[PDB]
Amino acid sequence: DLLERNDIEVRERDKYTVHTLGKKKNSVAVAFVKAGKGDILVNNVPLALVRPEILRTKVSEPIMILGESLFKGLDMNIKVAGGGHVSQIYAVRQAISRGVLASVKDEAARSELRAKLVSYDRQLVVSDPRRCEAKKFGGRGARARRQKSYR
Amino acid sequence: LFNKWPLTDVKCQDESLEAYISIDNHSFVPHSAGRWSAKRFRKAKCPVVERLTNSLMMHGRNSGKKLMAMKTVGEAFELINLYTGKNPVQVLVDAVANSGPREDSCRIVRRQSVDVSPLRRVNIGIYNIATGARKAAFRKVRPFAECLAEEIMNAAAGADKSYAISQRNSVERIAVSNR
Amino acid sequence: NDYRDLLRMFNTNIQGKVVLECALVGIKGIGRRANIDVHKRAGELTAAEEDALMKVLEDPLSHGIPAWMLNRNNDFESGKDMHILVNTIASTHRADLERLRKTRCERGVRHHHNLKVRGQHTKSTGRRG
């Protein structure tokens, strides 16, 4: 589940033309676009069905920013491995936006979809690294130390 | 918010609080980690509903549980809309605006009355409304959602019954006396 | 909605409002070591179903209840597992303490001196004794 050759091992043939990624909080996602009928699936599960039911709107933000035309022809297949439930929905959004960017990247029109998406939501395109810190001796956490008995 | 309640005409009515309030930059559902703890006043640019949903995740127990909180303020929001026939976010902006106390007697022994900043009033108003619900959601029958919504409606009116309004008036009380 | 009030099984008071599973949760305190719907509620329960249950509780190994699911499992008198409640738990607990008193054992002395038996730190966590 951590940065292995898993990125391409899931699909044999059915060559995808556009490759994109979305990775946050150890949850890494690899997104492969075949540009067919525009439908999006993540981990074999259609994007319209997402396990958190409130967090389907977070996943459908790239799609909500641009019109149906952009996603009318872009068929995306996504594969999120590792991290956690919430880090996986956050990862999905980053990968879908890298996929639209990759379709119009050569033209100066890449700028239009980067501005609109980013202005509505930061991290729709970018990925905030915020990695976890390390426990140090004398404490149960990086910022937490055990209660001192005297003084 | 929750595929409903657009902030089309929802707006603040109090000028000072409006400067620190968000009624436009709201992502769908009260989520998104924007690091609004960063820099200094990133709270102003943070969706009020997120600020409210973040307050609920406190007092241990429900610590960090944003999803449960998001669906709880969604249950409260629908209760608010149904009770007042009014967009919940407009009632929310008014509730957290009236609740914030404008006069606090800090130490500055003796104590002296000092004017309260609009950000502090914005943060206390959100905080008091949750605690008004949290306290009334303990060993009681009404769910945390029904108190959070009960508190919000009275706070918009200014009815002392809301814990936030009573604490605001008690804060401004000990402030007037220790001027 | 049909409602019946308090019932008594093995000289216990049973609240009709609670679900049947909760109603039996304690019989004479020492009781809960079936053919009736457990969600029906004690008031909803019929006399007849209770009679079938009365047979089930008196003779557990007759209706598909297992040996492991029994309160007692090897006895000290018959060598056989059985389900005992109400006064019998009290009489057998007395009998089990009396057997521990009979011969001198660590189990016997501790149960009398009120020290925890099989327990460990008596030094810091038995306070208020």
Added chain:
Amino acid sequence: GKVRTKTIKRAARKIVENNYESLKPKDFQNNKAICSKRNVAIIPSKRLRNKVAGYVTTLMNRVVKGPV
């Protein structure tokens, strides 16, 4: 919150008083390239080298913009 050490300041000032012509006033990267030449100066590490270069681009702006 970044105050340079004496070693960084001293090395950078020799770089400017000698290769002023090679340096350019506003860009750190051109100044970093002059530091990378190695024939002009030996700089151990990448961070140490960048700090000497960064001070040297401020120095370059300052020496054109009045005497230093």
Added chain:
Amino acid sequence: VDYPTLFADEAAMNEALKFIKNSKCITHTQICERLRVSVALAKRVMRQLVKSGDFAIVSKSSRMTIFKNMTKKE
């Protein structure tokens, strides 16, 4: 303390339904405070009231069932 109902509403059930129908909205717990039913009983009778269509569930959640009467408009 509170009154455990024992699902005892019979002739009284029809008037209990009458008050619930009159109220603009009902939640499973609101009934339990207003009339001392167990909130479990409140779900029981509410399922019958929605079965007629007197009430409309705005939203169903495992704990909170939000019902506003679709009727009472007339």
Added chain:
Amino acid sequence: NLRAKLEEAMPIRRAAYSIIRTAMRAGAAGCEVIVAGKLRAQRARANKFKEGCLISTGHPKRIFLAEATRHIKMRQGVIGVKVRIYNPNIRGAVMPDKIEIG
């Protein structure tokens, strides 16, 4: 060499001063000798005799120093000798802060 020289009962200062010379001649810019114990007394003390500048901390210290610890035995008791030799010219590279600027 020091531990065995100390055994012949030579002056402890002279022992360190002779060892200090042969490291500086061999090139070490930093030379440090510390002998600690009950020396000429019934009480503990530490006697540092040092010639030159030695780095004492950081990644250069790991590769640019030669700390060697030995435990002399004496009728009074153990008087361990510690010698640390610092070579900036280690030929493995340069000191991280040494800007040649030539």
Added chain:
Amino acid sequence: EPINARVIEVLGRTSSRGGITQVKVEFMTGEKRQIIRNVIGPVRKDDILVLMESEREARRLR
């Protein structure tokens, strides 16, 4: 009566803990007198304060 009064400059905080900032307030709603007014809470220039008891001016005299 509540009065609207914006900050003119955010002066260094006193209060012995640094908690209470010093702010100058001109009643934008009236004669604009820039009386100093002590403020508890995070503040930046141009943040309106609605209170102005007007029976108190701040002390910044050293």
Added chain:
Amino acid sequence: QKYTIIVVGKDLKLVERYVKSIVKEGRAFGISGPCRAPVRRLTITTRKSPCGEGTNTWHRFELRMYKRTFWVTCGGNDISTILSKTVVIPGIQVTVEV
């Protein structure tokens, strides 16, 4: 016949030259591309103090073990020729396999 080669080096710099030498000796025998086994981190955390007195400060000691993947299709004598040919640096793990 193809023979498996595994090299384990504690110090990355010492194996770094060995991997460069491995290509420069077995190029004719078609040595496999040097895939690197993920580091095996041997970690021991021990109290720094000989006693337990003072603050409980912990001394962390870590030995990182690096391994590389190699395969050569060559004769039985030819692996021995590369084994002599590769740069010999002390304290290295040498593997000959089938």
Added chain:
Amino acid sequence: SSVTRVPADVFINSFAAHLKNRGIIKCPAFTDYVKTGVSRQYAPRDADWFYIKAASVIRHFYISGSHSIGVAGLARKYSSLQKGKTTPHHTKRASCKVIRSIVSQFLGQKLLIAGERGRHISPNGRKMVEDFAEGLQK
């Protein structure tokens, strides 16, 4: 794809009902008076639990695709934490005998095949999982 498009929990509940009518599984005697898991101290109140579990084991085997993993792997999927201890709570696996008695029953009915090691969905069974998903689709 097909069953994957259907919400797995919705498919599991609906298929369990179908398996009971279709005569698949036919729950054993021990399952009425047993609590799944060493962590759970309470028996399931569903009364159709051995059917809902049996949709979970066979559909999870469909998810295996070609894994041929065993009963303990499925038991881990339905595991939860043991409480009732002063010490903190730790995850305990599901009871294997219930899980063994459905995978063996499925293979016995030829809905599953023992290719090697554990079990993978049989081609005869593969139609069943897809068939029900198609019914859910409309």
Added chain:
RNA sequence: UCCAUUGCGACAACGAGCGAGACCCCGGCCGCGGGCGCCGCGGGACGGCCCGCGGCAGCGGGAGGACGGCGGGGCGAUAGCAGGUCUGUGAUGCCCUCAGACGCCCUGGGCCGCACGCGCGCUACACUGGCGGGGCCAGCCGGCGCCCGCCAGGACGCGCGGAGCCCCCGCCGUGGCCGGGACCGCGGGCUGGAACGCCCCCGCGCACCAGGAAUGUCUUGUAGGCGCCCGCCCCCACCGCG
């Protein structure tokens, strides 16, 4: 002025040195190659840029960018403390024993005995919950299969293979209650030469309804909540390090 003997400026000082810093370990980013294994080698960030302010050092905003202005560590001068360790050792002085030994083995007990006081913890006090039927995602990094058994485990072979929280839906309904699981009584296993160890099943149902004077640690992936791994291990973690 910095955070900093960090600098800048002036001076009976003028030059140095060590500590700081630098380096190092990891991370997030972008390439270049390689393959059984994502892991080898490099760049990328420097207060550069913009604007104000200051001789200046720099200060505070902006931008541009994974990353912005002491990460998240390691190493930590000088002079010390009669701080702790002779019970870690073929480190050790002085010393004590040395054949009924203060040597070593063998057996049985003790460190875990409990009127009580305290320190670090763990689980609580419920409905922002217990219940428990499914979905489902980990990282230090990692094995399973088949039957038998309620489990606990076991037989038998082989190389394999992944949490909780949360999510939905039931349910209980403010009742020391369907919260809590402390103690106790039958059993069923396991590890070992042996429980006096642990695990599990049926019981059993203590206080506890939010804690006085005091206090303790913390500012981003942080507090907290939540699981998991290893160490010491025959068994066993409310522990430590992760």
